[PDB]
Amino acid sequence: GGTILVVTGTGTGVGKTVVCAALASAARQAGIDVAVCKPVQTGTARGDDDLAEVGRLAGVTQLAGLARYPQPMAPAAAAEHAGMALPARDQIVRLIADLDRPGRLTLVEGAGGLLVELAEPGVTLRDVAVDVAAAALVVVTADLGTLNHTKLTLEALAAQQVSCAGLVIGSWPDPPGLVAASNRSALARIAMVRAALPAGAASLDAGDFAAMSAAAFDRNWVAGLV
Amino acid sequence: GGTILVVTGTGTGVGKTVVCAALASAARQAGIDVAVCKPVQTGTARGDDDLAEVGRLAGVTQLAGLARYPQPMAPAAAAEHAGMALPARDQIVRLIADLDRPGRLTLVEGAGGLLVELAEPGVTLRDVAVDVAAAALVVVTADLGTLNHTKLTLEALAAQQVSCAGLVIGSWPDPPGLVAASNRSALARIAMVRAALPAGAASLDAGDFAAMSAAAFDRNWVAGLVG
Numbered sequence A: 001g002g003t004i005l006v007v008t009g010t011g012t013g014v015g016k017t018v019v020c021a022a023l024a025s026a027a028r029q030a031g032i033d034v035a036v037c038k039p040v041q042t043g044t045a046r047g048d049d050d051l052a053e054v055g056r057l058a059g060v061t062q063l064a065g066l067a068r069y070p071q072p073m074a075p076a077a078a079a080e081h082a083g084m085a086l087p088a089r090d091q092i093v094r095l096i097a098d099l100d101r102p103g104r105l106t107l108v109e110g111a112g113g114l115l116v117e118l119a120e121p122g123v124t125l126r127d128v129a130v131d132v133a134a135a136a137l138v139v140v141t142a143d144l145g146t147l148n149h150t151k152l153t154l155e156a157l158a159a160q161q162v163s164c165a166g167l168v169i170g171s172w173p174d175p176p177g178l179v180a181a182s183n184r185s186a187l188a189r190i191a192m193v194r195a196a197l198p199a200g201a202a203s204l205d206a207g208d209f210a211a212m213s214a215a216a217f218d219r220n221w222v223a224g225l226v
Numbered sequence B: 001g002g003t004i005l006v007v008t009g010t011g012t013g014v015g016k017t018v019v020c021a022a023l024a025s026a027a028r029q030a031g032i033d034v035a036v037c038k039p040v041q042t043g044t045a046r047g048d049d050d051l052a053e054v055g056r057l058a059g060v061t062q063l064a065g066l067a068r069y070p071q072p073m074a075p076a077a078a079a080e081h082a083g084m085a086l087p088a089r090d091q092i093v094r095l096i097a098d099l100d101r102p103g104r105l106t107l108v109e110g111a112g113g114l115l116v117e118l119a120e121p122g123v124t125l126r127d128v129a130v131d132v133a134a135a136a137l138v139v140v141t142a143d144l145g146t147l148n149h150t151k152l153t154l155e156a157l158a159a160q161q162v163s164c165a166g167l168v169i170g171s172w173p174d175p176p177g178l179v180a181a182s183n184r185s186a187l188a189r190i191a192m193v194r195a196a197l198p199a200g201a202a203s204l205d206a207g208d209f210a211a212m213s214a215a216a217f218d219r220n221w222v223a224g225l226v227g
Ligand SMILES: Nc1ccn([C@@H]2O[C@H](COP(=O)(O)OP(=O)(O)OP(=O)(O)O)[C@@H](O)[C@H]2O)c(=O)n1
Pocket: A009, A011, A012, A013, A014, A015, A016, A017, A018, A019, A111, A112, A170, A171, A172, A197, A198, A199, A200, A201, A202, A203
C-alpha cells in the first residue's frame, strides 16, 4: 500500500474539492503520484463535476468515480429522486484499495460532511475511511461556527479511530476580518492547520493554481505524506 | 427538582432563541411555569439580547443571564477582546440550579452550537447538561447539510450519555422545496421531530406567536415535560 487520505469537511461548500486539487498539485510538485476518487457525484444536471475540477486545476489523471446523479441533492436523496440505489459499500472500498499503491497519495472525496450517506445501507465516508485505514484531512471554514463544527467532526473521527491528518481552511478571505483571524488561531489550538487557501483560487488557471498550492502547504509535510 | 432542557443547535443562527420562546409559550399555555436561562451572551454591543427576545415573544418573566460580552464572536473570543474572562463551570451550573423548581420547565439556551466553549477550559453546554442532568433539545435547519450536522450533534450527545429530547426545525419554509421536504422526512427517521417553526415567526405579535406556539408542539409532549 501507499498513503490513503480521505478529504472531508465540516459541511457542504467549504471547498473540499479545491483542497483536494491543491494538495494534489502540491504532492505532484513534490513528485508524488496522486489519484483522486469521488465515488458519488450529485448535481450533474447543472454540471457539478469535482473530478474534472481536480483534473483541470492539478493535472491529476487518475480520477475515479462510480455514480453520477443529476439532482443537486444529498446523495441518498438524489438516488431516491432518480429511482436508483447508491453504490454498495464494497464497490467504494475496493475501488479505493485498487487505486492505492506504493508511492501514491490517494485522495478520497466524499459528498458534503462526514456523516452523509454514501452507499447502501447508510454507510458514510467515515465507514469507508475505516475500511481502508485512511487518515482524514478536515476542510473547515474561517467563519463563526467553524469551531463547533470542527470539534464535532474531529470527535466523530476519533469515535471510530480514524486518525486526523489535519485541517485546511478551504477559503481564506481578503481582507480577513476579526472573526476569521481569531478563528484561525483557535483552529490551530485544536489541530494542525495545514493550509489556508486564498478565497477565489478555484478560478485560477493551472499555472497560478500550482504556484498558490505550492506555497500553501508545508513542503516537508507534503513530502512526508508518502 | 423540576425539568431542565438545554436547547442547543447544529450551529449558530438556526433559531435556538425563537424555539426557546416557542416552547416556553406552549408550556406556559399548558399551565407550566417556565424559566429561560442564557448563561453566556455575546454581541451585546450590537443589541443582541436573547433573554429579552424570549420575554418579548413569549412573556417569560423569569430570565437569568450571567456573562455578557460586547462583540458578536465566540464567547472565548468575545471575552478575550473585552479583556474579560469566561465564567466558571460552577457559576453556570449554579445559575441553572437556582432556577430549578418542581413543576417548572427551565430552558437553558447556549452560545452557538453544542461544542462552543462556555467556561474554562473547553467546558461546553454538553458538560453543563451532564452536570445538571438535563436533556438536550436540538434545533436544526431544513437546509442541505442539516443531516450531517444533526447526526454529529446527536452523536456528540450520546458520547456523554446526554438524552436527546427530540429535534425542532427552527425555520420551516412555506412552501418546502425538494431538499427541505427530503431533509424533514430523513430527520424524522433520525429522531423525534417535535416541531417545525414556520419561517419568520419572530415577526408574529404576542397572540400570533402564542397561537403558532401552541400548534407547533404536540400538547401532550409539552405537558409530559413536567410532572
Ligand atoms: N479558496 C477557494 C475555495 C473554494 N472556492 C469555491 O468555493 C466553492 C465551494 O467550494 P468547493 O471546492 O466546491 O468544495 P465542496 O466542499 O466540495 O462543495 P460540496 O461538497 O458541497 O459539493 C466553489 O465554487 C469553489 O469554486 C473558491 O473560489 N476559492
